[PDB]
Amino acid sequence: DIYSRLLKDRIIMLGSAIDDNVANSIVSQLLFLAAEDPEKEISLYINSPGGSITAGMAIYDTMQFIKPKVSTICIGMAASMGAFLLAAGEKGKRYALPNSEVMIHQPLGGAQGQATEIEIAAKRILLLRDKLNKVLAERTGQPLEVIERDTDRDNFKSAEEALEYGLIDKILTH
């Protein structure tokens, strides 16, 4: 398997929407690689449209927990929680290819039923938007107010624009 080969060289591929399955796999791989060598850095290649917020945070929390530094490479598209994960890479080691696309926006969800239940859902997603925005702010250098404003609607960015924004640190060329 081509991917299993990449794993042998400490490279994890996040190339599908993020759901609990994908999340659990990535997390396991991260813990595995960290176990084999807590020194050698790990590379997380990203080409994902995003997905579950709790799934992404599982990945994020694991990236932070392990000792090895996790570098992130945006290949193709890094949208929503995928973009979040890209920004979460080890400061100084967050890359993107020349024509990569990075999109940041606010969480998506739903609420059905009684006003009380809709309110429960509302508070949760609003709380999540804040928790995410705060991390984005820290990771980019942008003030929170700026992150809140810029993520109000789908915000597509070129690699050059992602760099200027503080989402990535370098654009891979040749």
């Binding site: 400490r10 490279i11 290649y45 490479i73 290949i75």
Partner: peptide, 6 residues
Amino acid sequence: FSPXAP
């Protein structure tokens, strides 16, 4: 995707 990741 080296130089430099690996």
